[PDB]
Design a protein around this motif. Structure first.
Motif, PDB file in Angstrom:
ATOM      1  N   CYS A  48       0.814  -1.126   0.040  1.00  0.00           N
ATOM      2  CA  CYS A  48       0.112   0.061  -0.041  1.00  0.00           C
ATOM      3  C   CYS A  48       0.804   1.006  -0.135  1.00  0.00           C
ATOM      4  N   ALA A  49       2.142   1.046   0.289  1.00  0.00           N
ATOM      5  CA  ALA A  49       3.235   1.975   0.195  1.00  0.00           C
ATOM      6  C   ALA A  49       3.821   1.932  -1.211  1.00  0.00           C
ATOM      7  N   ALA A  50       3.982   3.140  -1.854  1.00  0.00           N
ATOM      8  CA  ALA A  50       4.255   3.084  -3.089  1.00  0.00           C
ATOM      9  C   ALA A  50       5.721   2.782  -3.230  1.00  0.00           C
ATOM     10  N   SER A  51       6.569   3.176  -2.407  1.00  0.00           N
ATOM     11  CA  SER A  51       8.120   2.663  -2.322  1.00  0.00           C
ATOM     12  C   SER A  51       8.273   2.455  -1.126  1.00  0.00           C
ATOM     13  N   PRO A  52       9.383   1.743  -0.898  1.00  0.00           N
ATOM     14  CA  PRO A  52       9.920   1.300   0.648  1.00  0.00           C
ATOM     15  C   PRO A  52      10.316   2.548   1.569  1.00  0.00           C
ATOM     16  N   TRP A  53      10.734   3.658   0.866  1.00  0.00           N
ATOM     17  CA  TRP A  53      11.433   4.701   1.093  1.00  0.00           C
ATOM     18  C   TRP A  53      10.653   5.578   2.175  1.00  0.00           C
ATOM     19  N   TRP A  54      11.260   6.042   3.334  1.00  0.00           N
ATOM     20  CA  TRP A  54      10.968   6.828   4.354  1.00  0.00           C
ATOM     21  C   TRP A  54      10.800   8.203   3.788  1.00  0.00           C
ATOM     22  N   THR A  55       9.846   9.082   4.414  1.00  0.00           N
ATOM     23  CA  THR A  55       9.836  10.376   4.131  1.00  0.00           C
ATOM     24  C   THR A  55       9.044  11.014   5.212  1.00  0.00           C
ATOM     25  N   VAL A  56       9.692  12.464   5.530  1.00  0.00           N
ATOM     26  CA  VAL A  56       9.139  13.312   6.653  1.00  0.00           C
ATOM     27  C   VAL A  56       7.846  14.029   5.930  1.00  0.00           C
ATOM     28  N   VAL A  57       6.491  13.852   6.802  1.00  0.00           N
ATOM     29  CA  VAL A  57       5.248  14.426   6.388  1.00  0.00           C
ATOM     30  C   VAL A  57       5.094  15.525   7.442  1.00  0.00           C
ATOM     31  N   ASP A  58       4.682  16.889   6.949  1.00  0.00           N
ATOM     32  CA  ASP A  58       3.992  17.763   7.788  1.00  0.00           C
ATOM     33  C   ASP A  58       2.668  17.229   8.669  1.00  0.00           C
ATOM     34  N   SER A  59       2.355  17.815   9.827  1.00  0.00           N
ATOM     35  CA  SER A  59       1.162  17.431  10.371  1.00  0.00           C
ATOM     36  C   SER A  59       0.817  18.484  11.340  1.00  0.00           C
ATOM     37  N   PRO A  60      -0.214  18.561  12.149  1.00  0.00           N
ATOM     38  CA  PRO A  60      -0.583  19.666  13.075  1.00  0.00           C
ATOM     39  C   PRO A  60       0.622  19.322  14.402  1.00  0.00           C
ATOM     40  N   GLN A  61       0.938  18.146  14.837  1.00  0.00           N
ATOM     41  CA  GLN A  61       1.532  17.788  15.868  1.00  0.00           C
ATOM     42  C   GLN A  61       3.383  17.979  15.531  1.00  0.00           C
TER      43      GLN A  61
ATOM     44  N   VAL B  45      10.384  14.460  14.091  1.00  0.00           N
ATOM     45  CA  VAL B  45      11.496  15.333  14.418  1.00  0.00           C
ATOM     46  C   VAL B  45      11.116  16.154  15.678  1.00  0.00           C
ATOM     47  N   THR B  46      12.282  16.310  16.333  1.00  0.00           N
ATOM     48  CA  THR B  46      12.018  16.992  17.708  1.00  0.00           C
ATOM     49  C   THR B  46      13.139  18.174  18.310  1.00  0.00           C
ATOM     50  N   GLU B  47      12.962  18.502  19.207  1.00  0.00           N
ATOM     51  CA  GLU B  47      13.726  19.477  19.864  1.00  0.00           C
ATOM     52  C   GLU B  47      14.500  19.028  20.826  1.00  0.00           C
ATOM     53  N   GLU B  48      15.716  18.548  20.430  1.00  0.00           N
ATOM     54  CA  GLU B  48      16.841  17.867  21.257  1.00  0.00           C
ATOM     55  C   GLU B  48      16.334  16.726  22.082  1.00  0.00           C
ATOM     56  N   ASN B  49      15.957  15.921  21.488  1.00  0.00           N
ATOM     57  CA  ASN B  49      15.482  14.420  22.261  1.00  0.00           C
ATOM     58  C   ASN B  49      15.891  13.414  20.867  1.00  0.00           C
ATOM     59  N   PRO B  50      17.199  13.497  20.569  1.00  0.00           N
ATOM     60  CA  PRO B  50      17.731  12.618  19.688  1.00  0.00           C
ATOM     61  C   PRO B  50      17.611  11.162  20.092  1.00  0.00           C
ATOM     62  N   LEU B  51      17.306  10.270  19.116  1.00  0.00           N
ATOM     63  CA  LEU B  51      17.441   8.942  19.354  1.00  0.00           C
ATOM     64  C   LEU B  51      18.758   8.333  18.769  1.00  0.00           C
ATOM     65  N   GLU B  52      19.255   7.379  19.486  1.00  0.00           N
ATOM     66  CA  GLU B  52      20.737   6.944  18.902  1.00  0.00           C
ATOM     67  C   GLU B  52      20.515   5.541  18.347  1.00  0.00           C
ATOM     68  N   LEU B  53      21.278   5.384  17.328  1.00  0.00           N
ATOM     69  CA  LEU B  53      21.237   4.023  16.657  1.00  0.00           C
ATOM     70  C   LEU B  53      22.624   3.376  16.575  1.00  0.00           C
ATOM     71  N   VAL B  54      22.338   1.930  16.549  1.00  0.00           N
ATOM     72  CA  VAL B  54      23.721   1.131  16.232  1.00  0.00           C
ATOM     73  C   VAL B  54      23.171   0.474  14.945  1.00  0.00           C
ATOM     74  N   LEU B  55      23.713   0.434  14.149  1.00  0.00           N
ATOM     75  CA  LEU B  55      23.473  -0.209  12.634  1.00  0.00           C
ATOM     76  C   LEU B  55      24.012  -1.975  12.693  1.00  0.00           C
ATOM     77  N   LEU B  56      23.062  -2.790  12.811  1.00  0.00           N
ATOM     78  CA  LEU B  56      23.239  -4.148  12.871  1.00  0.00           C
ATOM     79  C   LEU B  56      23.050  -4.778  11.760  1.00  0.00           C
ATOM     80  N   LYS B  57      23.897  -5.222  10.919  1.00  0.00           N
ATOM     81  CA  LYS B  57      23.714  -6.005   9.799  1.00  0.00           C
ATOM     82  C   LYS B  57      22.984  -7.047   9.837  1.00  0.00           C
ATOM     83  N   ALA B  58      21.871  -7.109   8.693  1.00  0.00           N
ATOM     84  CA  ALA B  58      20.833  -8.065   8.527  1.00  0.00           C
ATOM     85  C   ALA B  58      21.102  -9.401   7.316  1.00  0.00           C
TER      86      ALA B  58
END
Length: 183
Positions: free
Chosen positions: A85-98, A162-175
């Motif tokens: 139902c997703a056109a492509s697998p790619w993530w994108t940032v969409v605006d909204s009220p929040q 997207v946030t005002e300094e509440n960054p999440l941290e990630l570790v990229l684990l090969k699949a």
């Protein structure tokens, strides 16, 4: 020099699939999708709240024809197995009220709207941990001064946004490997 490195000291492959896991184990599991609001299917990207789960494998692709990904390079992120139902697998940032929200789309999108991310290495760490920046690439140009952090909703969904300094941290684990079963 300065390429993205995975959880095992190895260079992240361009177009390769990884599990995007938290730095601090106790903060949840990997990345996946959820159906939210008026959505026809799971189109919101959220962090799994269950530590055992590695989430969905994610393809990391950069703008260059390079085997590996250098820091400083914009990347497109997409699920290896997108919701039909997703056109492509790619993530994108969409605006909204929040505020601006990360998610999939029902309509196949242009490259300037998907090449909107960039990993920034974490300072105080023994291994390679990164923060995820969102780069304002809409009003013809690109400036990464925003971060992707989590925002827990009413239903308890830890949604990437997207946030005002509440960054999440990630570790990229090969699949590529394993899983189990009951009886």
């Amino acid at each position: 020099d300065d390429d993205l490195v995975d959880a095992e000291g190895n260079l992240v492959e361009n177009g390769g699939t990884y599990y995007l896991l938290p730095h601090i184990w106790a903060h949840g599991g990997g990345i996946e999708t959820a159906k939210t609001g008026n959505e026809p299917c799971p189109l919101t990207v959220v962090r799994s709240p269950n530590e055992v789960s590695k989430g969905e494998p994610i393809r990391i692709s950069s703008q260059f024809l390079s085997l590996f990904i250098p820091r400083g390079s914009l990347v497109a992120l997409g699920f290896a197995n997108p919701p039909s139902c997703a056109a492509s697998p790619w993530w994108t940032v969409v605006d909204s009220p929040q505020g601006p929200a990360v998610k999939l789309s029902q309509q196949k999108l242009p490259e300037k709207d998907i090449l909107v991310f960039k990993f920034e290495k974490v300072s105080h760490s023994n291994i390679h941990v990164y923060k995820l920046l969102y780069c304002q690439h809409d009003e013809e140009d690109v400036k990464c001064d925003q971060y992707i952090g989590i925002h827990r909703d009413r239903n308890g969904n830890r949604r990437l946004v997207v946030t005002e300094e509440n960054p999440l941290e990630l570790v990229l684990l090969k699949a590529k490997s394993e899983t189990a079963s009951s009886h």
